[PDB]
Design an enzyme around this catalytic site. Sequence first.
Site, short mmCIF file in Angstrom:
data_model
loop_
_atom_site.label_atom_id
_atom_site.label_comp_id
_atom_site.label_asym_id
_atom_site.label_seq_id
_atom_site.Cartn_x
_atom_site.Cartn_y
_atom_site.Cartn_z
N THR A 110 45.36 32.18 51.96
CA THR A 110 46.16 30.99 51.69
C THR A 110 45.51 30.03 50.71
O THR A 110 46.15 29.05 50.31
CB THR A 110 46.48 30.24 53.01
N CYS A 111 44.27 30.31 50.28
CA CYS A 111 43.44 29.31 49.60
C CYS A 111 44.12 28.79 48.34
O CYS A 111 44.31 29.53 47.37
CB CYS A 111 42.08 29.92 49.27
N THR A 112 44.47 27.50 48.34
CA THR A 112 45.15 26.94 47.17
C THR A 112 44.20 26.70 45.99
O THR A 112 44.65 26.68 44.85
CB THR A 112 45.87 25.65 47.54
N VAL A 147 42.24 29.02 45.17
CA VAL A 147 42.40 30.32 44.53
C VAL A 147 43.75 30.40 43.83
O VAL A 147 43.83 30.79 42.66
CB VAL A 147 42.22 31.48 45.54
N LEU A 148 44.82 30.03 44.53
CA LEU A 148 46.15 30.04 43.92
C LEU A 148 46.20 29.24 42.62
O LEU A 148 46.77 29.70 41.62
CB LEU A 148 47.18 29.50 44.91
#
Lengths: 75, 177
Positions: free
Chosen positions: B147-149, B151-152
């Site tokens: 879910t890491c934003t 990373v996103l």
Amino acid sequence: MQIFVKTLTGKTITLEVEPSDTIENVKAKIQDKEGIPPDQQRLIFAGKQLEDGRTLSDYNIQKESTLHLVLRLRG
Amino acid sequence: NFVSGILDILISDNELKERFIEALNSNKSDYKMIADDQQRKLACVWNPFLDGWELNAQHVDMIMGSHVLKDMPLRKQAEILFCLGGVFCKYSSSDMFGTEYDSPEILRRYANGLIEQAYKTDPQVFGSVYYYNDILDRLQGRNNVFTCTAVLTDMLTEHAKESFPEIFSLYYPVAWR
């Protein structure tokens, strides 16, 4: 006994529960009803975060109490 | 600085608007918005714009008529909307208002509503429906994806930087590239 779990947007999903249910068990019924995994579920009651080892009775959660769900997604 | 423009219209509260606009000038915020009181605060501001994970139709009309998207061709509109989804994804991430294990849930839904809105405007901007759905899956927590934003956000700026670099350069905060 019914309880309610409210999201940040106003949606209300209802569960059937017992006061001796653990918080793990409650999050599990939300995953049954809504597909949200437990480790994504931050549950709150009366300004208090519902820890996993505990029961509804531990937090004086009663029939038709409303809990607040905030999604725990990593930053 | 098209972004401080749009925050000006979107956040009525002057303390919060100030917070968001100050954060455009740094790559890391030490003010966090994952606490319960903060998430309700955001919720109060942004619920009038949301319908679950989507922008509501009145917000969409408003935003497409804004100084930012009004006379633009569809593709630019889409490209512009894509960068705004990246901005809210950053805002939600661990470098801004989020933390390693938590993020402001409302900002993820607004970032998602903008990404979804961009697909509706011109889906070519994403280049693949599988990419559009991995982006949604990461903002929403679906299908067991990480879910890491933080990373996103990288995945989004890298697409913007190569697919539409002019738009990205103008519509994504300088301090954040």
